[PDB]
Design a binder for this molecule. Structure first.
Ligand SMILES: Cc1cc(NCc2cccnc2)nc(N)n1
Ligand SMILES: Cc1cc(NCc2cccnc2)nc(N)n1
Ligand SMILES: Cc1cc(NCc2cccnc2)nc(N)n1
Length: 330
């Protein structure tokens, strides 16, 4: 089997991406944020505290003939940014892009943080990191990809995020029309439950490539590119008037600037992030200070190749017995 679904940025600056997912029978379609940095599939629901719902579509298990309470099960997740949610669990039929999983754990939110509530376009999360990070207790649950894997033509999914445009998530096949050149595969460590890999270095604009190992994760859930402070300083030093602002919490640049590209290594290959991709717009409406897309990881504890980096590539998440990542230009 395979599946193919379009993923659409929620706003004009690609602050996040949503992908329609069918849950239940008859289908309830919710727009979920596909997250390769977490492992829970959770949704706004008929159980979510009413004051914490502001425009999201909700899952109503009582309206699904295939829903079953996973009795006793609970979940609770705190993401790096201090965003949180928690609740109980149902199993139901979930379909993404024509690929169906029966008995998928669908984690129903009872509580969500204000950040989730205000994000009216995002009805929940679909985690695609390793199932060892799933937060369901007392019986940990599998991701949609782990449940689908045995049925797929190839045990892979691919992320093809657009710049200011829709893109695609495919499951079970590699669309050889979706990229240019060849895919360069690189080793993954699953020790922390993430798609963790080592980049071979970076360049700023037209500058020389610096060969240096940068461990990090491939995380569609994260909007920006978080790298060591040395790398990030080297980037923003090439932008007149860029600075790190404690008041904003990281790098801002003049909205009159033209940003340089950023290149990252994947083995002997190179992925170029155009400068435009690193411009996340005014820090407040009308401001002439714009929010940088490359930020320091130093206050995180991990480097994160988030959407700013991933959208520059066709990315293969190979879930073979020995997982690997693949990157191609596009
Ligand atoms: C899931 C998601 C991410 C995101 N990132 C950009 C962001 C983060 C914090 C402050 N200002 C902008 N923005 C939204 N709306 N949803
Ligand atoms: C995948 C994902 C979504 C999310 N949504 C909440 C949110 C955060 C920032 C701005 N607006 C909303 N928070 C996180 N950490 N990951
Ligand atoms: C994405 C983005 C927006 C922006 N807005 C500020 C602006 C520009 C032009 C006219 N009036 C206001 N500046 C930049 N550089 N990038």
């Amino acid at each position: 089997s395979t599946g193919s679904a379009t993923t659409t940025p929620i706003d004009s600056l690609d602050d996040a991406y949503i992908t329609p997912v069918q849950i239940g029978t008859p289908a309830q379609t919710l727009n979920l944020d596909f997250d390769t940095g977490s492992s829970d599939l959770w949704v706004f629901s008929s159980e979510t505290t009413a004051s914490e719902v502001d425009g999201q579509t909700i899952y109503t298990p009582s309206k699904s003939t295939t829903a079953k309470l996973l009795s006793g099960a609970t979940w609770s997740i705190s993401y790096g940014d201090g965003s949180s949610s928690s609740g109980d669990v149902y199993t139901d039929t979930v379909s993404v892009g024509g690929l169906t999983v029966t008995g998928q754990a669908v984690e129903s939110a009872k509580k969500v943080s204000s950040s989730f509530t205000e994000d009216s376009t995002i009805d929940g999360l679909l985690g695609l990191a390793f199932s060892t990070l799933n937060t369901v207790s007392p019986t940990q649950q599998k991701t949609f990809f782990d449940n689908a894997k045995a049925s797929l033509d190839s045990p892979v999914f691919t992320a093809d995020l657009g710049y200011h445009a829709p893109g695609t998530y495919n499951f079970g096949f590699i669309d050889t029309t979706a990229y240019t050149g060849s895919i360069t595969y690189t080793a993954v460590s699953t020790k922390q439950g993430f798609w963790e890999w080592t980049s071979t270095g970076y360049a700023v604009g037209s500058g020389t490539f610096k060969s240096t190992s940068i461990d990090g994760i491939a995380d569609t859930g994260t909007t920006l590119l978080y790298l060591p402070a040395t790398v990030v300083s080297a980037y923003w030093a090439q932008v007149s008037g860029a600075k790190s602002s404690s008041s904003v919490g990281g790098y801002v640049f003049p909205c009159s600037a033209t940003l340089p590209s950023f290149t990252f290594g994947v083995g002997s290959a190179r992925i170029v992030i155009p400068g435009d991709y690193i411009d996340f717009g005014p820090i407040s409406t009308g401001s002439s200070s714009c929010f940088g897309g490359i930020q320091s990881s130093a206050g995180i504890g991990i480097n994160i190749f988030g959407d700013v980096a991933l959208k520059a590539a066709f990315v293969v998440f190979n879930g073979a017995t020995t997982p690997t990542l693949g990157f191609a230009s596009k």
